[PDB]
Curated annotation (Swiss-Prot), chains A, B, C, D, E, F:
Disulfide bonds: 6-11
Gene that encodes it: INS
Source species, domain of life: Eukaryota
Species whose genome carries this gene: Homo sapiens
Protein name in the entry: Insulin A chain
Parent-protein residues present: 90 to 110 of 110
Amino acid sequence: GIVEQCCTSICSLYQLENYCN
Amino acid sequence: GIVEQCCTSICSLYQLENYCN
Amino acid sequence: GIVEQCCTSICSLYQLENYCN
Amino acid sequence: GIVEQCCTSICSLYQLENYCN
Amino acid sequence: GIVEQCCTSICSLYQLENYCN
Amino acid sequence: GIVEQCCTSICSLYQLENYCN
Amino acid sequence: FVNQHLCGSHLVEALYLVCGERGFFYTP
Amino acid sequence: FVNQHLCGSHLVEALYLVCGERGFFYTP
Amino acid sequence: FVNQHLCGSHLVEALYLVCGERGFFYTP
Amino acid sequence: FVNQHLCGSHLVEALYLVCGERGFFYTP
Amino acid sequence: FVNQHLCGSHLVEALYLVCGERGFFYTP
Amino acid sequence: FVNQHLCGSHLVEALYLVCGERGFFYTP
Ligand SMILES: Cc1cccc(O)c1
Ligand SMILES: Cc1cccc(O)c1
Ligand SMILES: Cc1cccc(O)c1
Ligand SMILES: Cc1cccc(O)c1
Ligand SMILES: Cc1cccc(O)c1
Ligand SMILES: Cc1cccc(O)c1
Ligand SMILES: Cc1cccc(O)c1
Ligand SMILES: Cc1cccc(O)c1
Ligand SMILES: Cc1cccc(O)c1
Ligand SMILES: [Cl-]
Ligand SMILES: [Cl-]
Ligand SMILES: [Zn+2]
Ligand SMILES: [Zn+2]
């Protein structure tokens, strides 16, 4: 999930975009 | 929606719960 | 105090409420 | 109070010090 | 400047890039 | 730089002021 | 749409806190 | 758990910004 | 009371920084 | 000390929200 | 100048995210 | 890298406040 992927290592705004509607 | 309901007039932390999963 | 109790482990909004006026 | 004094017109970080403990 | 351009009307994350180094 | 100096140990607002224009 | 943007930013932070483990949905 | 709580707070603000009109669901 | 809510959120953050170790009091 | 500074910043925002009209004192 | 202050606070956060490693400049 | 990202976010907000009219450059 998002916490598992982005709190461990940094996520770009492009990677974060995967979690959008 | 939440913006219409909570950006024109203040919402209690309770009304905010309506938007929790 | 609040830092000692809530920065070590997580506090719910109910636990935080103890620090209100 | 701070809202009356600082939400109608901007407060310097100095006037803000009046609200420190 | 950014305030004149983005505080009167909303700026896309793209127009915001104009202010990156 | 700022991250190296202020993310390692705490910086006062006076130390941060060195990074202003 | 700027004040609307600002309000939404604060609503999201608020839902993050109130909802906790439940999570929330934000639909502009 | 605190470290993750702090991270999540920043995650939702970034999602607010990146998703824009699309909005999002945040499931911790 | 929404703009007032928003302003207060930013005042609290500001007092947190300016006051430092001293701490502050926020009374709406 | 930084870790605590970061935490405290989030604490005061949550206090702002939870306490509402009551307000609060923040003593680090 | 209060709404202007509030907007600027959110612009800075936004530039922090969009610009990433590049960094940004904020000139009021 | 996350820890630093979190710190930097708080740094830029403090810079916004302390620098005021002067503004600043943030170079990570
Ligand atoms: C923007 C952001 C916030 C928190 C964690 C991340 O990986 C990225
Ligand atoms: C808590 C909160 C944030 C933003 C708008 C509101 O009505 C309520
Ligand atoms: C809401 C919140 C912020 C910081 C620490 C906590 O335990 C809880
Ligand atoms: C620094 C700050 C925040 C909010 C309102 C103000 O007048 C000043
Ligand atoms: C993203 C953002 C923040 C503040 C004002 C704007 O126009 C845009
Ligand atoms: C105000 C602040 C934020 C982040 C790191 C610091 O050293 C100080
Ligand atoms: C989560 C929640 C809702 C309402 C009041 C509280 O203290 C906490
Ligand atoms: C704490 C403080 C107040 C005023 C100016 C500063 O640089 C710092
Ligand atoms: C950095 C950036 C700009 C625009 C869109 C994005 O998803 C990310
Ligand atoms: Cl705002
Ligand atoms: Cl943090
Ligand atoms: Zn705001
Ligand atoms: Zn943080």
